[PDB]
Design a protein around this ligand. Structure first.
Ligand code: HEM
Length: 448
């Protein structure tokens, strides 16, 4: 074990920027000697650390992080093996692992021309734009914007919710020795998330200790379509039609829109529970007097959060906290993008403008984190194992099968064997894998 030097870790990895507005600025490097001078003089000093973001008194006006793709490291003359084959090959080459094609991607992602991403976050877009203008002014032509994506916390009563309306960012792994765990939260070694930290089994280049791999995905959400699907398929029952539709949505996610976990409140929302971080994660999927292998009355086996953090489905403690599959944890720092749903789109139940989630996951091993969750769990009709019926189906939120409707089982409380064939509501437009270096490497090795 080694001490976690949070002064040297970029803040979005373990804290999140937590600003109203964010920009993902995807760049190429020209004239690398010039880029390097400015990386050291202009970027390194303003990169926000975990220590800095952990203190509410030291949030910067513009929170800035930076990460490099494999081709960006090579553009900087860094030929080292960072110890991650998925990172080295790039996300476009990994697309088929997720039963999608780069044919659907933003063209800039379907390749390896992108050398890095600057994440800028501030409470206004004006301040972000000023920082971009400063960067472009000082780097000059040594940096070139290839693509960018603007994102924002949603307005009003949807602040912190993603575009389908669900509170998001509730559940994260706790870093042992750094975070004070919340009830039900998994507790993991720092090296699950931070390269070269405690119990990261993969040897890293020395300069890379304190970094993390950033998996970025531009995930479009078909919000009018999702809403209409829930109404059209709402289970029979006592409430309004919309209340019954809401129940189906909650069964798909594993939480009500308020954040309340269905495992703890399976038939109705509990907004007070959803808001309470001391209670809203305090579950394992186990219930005394129920067979874990067949009981879907509390939460379907196919629910998004159950697919992505299986808890007792992969063994371990039946009482909280369940600590299973710690090595498959990811830190998420996603933020919604695009316009709110327009009046006409809602009325027609049809998407016209692109909106969704600018998905960001951090992990020390891409093969254990984002890639694993997507391929081995969400996209696997027989995961979790040991269930009856054994065919759980796909994750209804993110599960993919090469554009086909997804078979998703267990969603209907009245009959756990009932199956639904559900079109995608989330459409990948691609992304890239980056390495967010420790801050010391920015003006250090990467600028050398
Ligand atoms: C547009 C796409 C997505 C949407 C709308 C979505 C939405 C949500 C929501 C509403 C939650 C529950 C609240 C929370 O804990 O934050 C959640 C949790 C989670 N999501 Fe997703 N998500 C998306 C994509 C993904 C992807 C691509 C992955 C990984 C491959 C993923 C992994 C997770 C994980 C690990 C959790 C927490 C599970 C837990 O610890 O209980 N999500 N997501």
């Amino acid at each position: 074990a080694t001490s976690l030097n949070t002064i040297d870790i970029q803040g979005d990895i373990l804290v999140g920027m937590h600003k109203q507005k964010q920009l993902f600025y995807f760049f190429a490097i020209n004239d690398p000697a010039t880029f390097k001078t400015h990386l050291a003089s202009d970027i390194a000093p303003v990169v926000a650390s975990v220590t800095q973001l952990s203190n509410v008194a030291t949030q910067p006006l513009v929170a800035l992080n930076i990460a490099f793709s494999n081709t960006g490291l090579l553009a900087l003359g860094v030929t080292d093996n960072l110890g991650d084959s998925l990172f080295a090959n790039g996300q476009a080459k990994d697309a088929t692992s997720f039963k999608e094609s780069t044919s659907s991607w933003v063209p800039q992602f379907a390749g390896t021309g992108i050398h890095g991403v600057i994440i800028l976050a501030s409470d206004t877009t004006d301040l972000i734009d000023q920082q971009v203008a400063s960067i472009e002014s000082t780097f000059g032509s040594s940096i070139s914007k290839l693509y960018s994506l603007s994102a924002s916390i949603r307005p009003g009563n949807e602040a912190g919710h993603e575009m389908f309306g669900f509170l998001n960012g509730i559940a994260q792994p706790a870093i042992n020795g750094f975070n004070t765990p919340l009830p039900g939260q998994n507790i993991v070694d720092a090296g699950v998330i931070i390269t070269g930290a405690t119990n990261d089994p993969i040897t890293r280049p020395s300069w890379a200790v304190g970094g993390s791999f950033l998996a970025f995905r531009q995930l479009e959400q078909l919000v009018p379509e999702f809403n209409k699907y829930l109404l059209d398929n709402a289970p029979a029952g006592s409430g309004s039609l919309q209340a019954r539709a809401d129940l189906l949505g909650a069964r798909m996610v594993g939480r009500w829109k308020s954040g309340a976990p269905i495992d703890l409140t399976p038939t109705a929302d509990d907004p007070a529970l959803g808001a309470d971080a001391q209670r809203n994660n305090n579950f394992t999927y186990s219930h005394a007097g129920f067979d874990l292998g067949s009981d879907q009355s509390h939460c379907p086996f196919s629910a998004h959060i159950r697919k992505t953090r299986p808890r007792a489905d992969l063994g371990g403690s039946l009482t909280p906290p369940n600590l299973s599959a710690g090595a498959n944890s990811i830190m998420r720092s996603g933020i919604p993008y695009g316009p709110e749903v327009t009046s006409a789109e809602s009325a027609s139940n049809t998407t016209t403008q692109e909106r969704g989630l600018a998905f960001v996951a951090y992990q020390a091993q891409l093969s254990q984190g984002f890639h694993f969750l997507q391929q081995t769990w969400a996209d696997n009709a027989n995961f979790p194992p040991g269930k009856t019926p054994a065919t759980v189906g796909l994750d209804p939120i993110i599960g993919q099968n090469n554009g086909q409707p997804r078979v998703v089982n267990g969603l209907l409380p009245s009959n756990s064997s009932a199956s639904l064939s559900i079109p995608q509501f989330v459409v990948s437009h691609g992304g890239e894998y980056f390495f967010s270096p420790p801050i010391s490497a920015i003006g250090g090795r990467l600028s050398a």
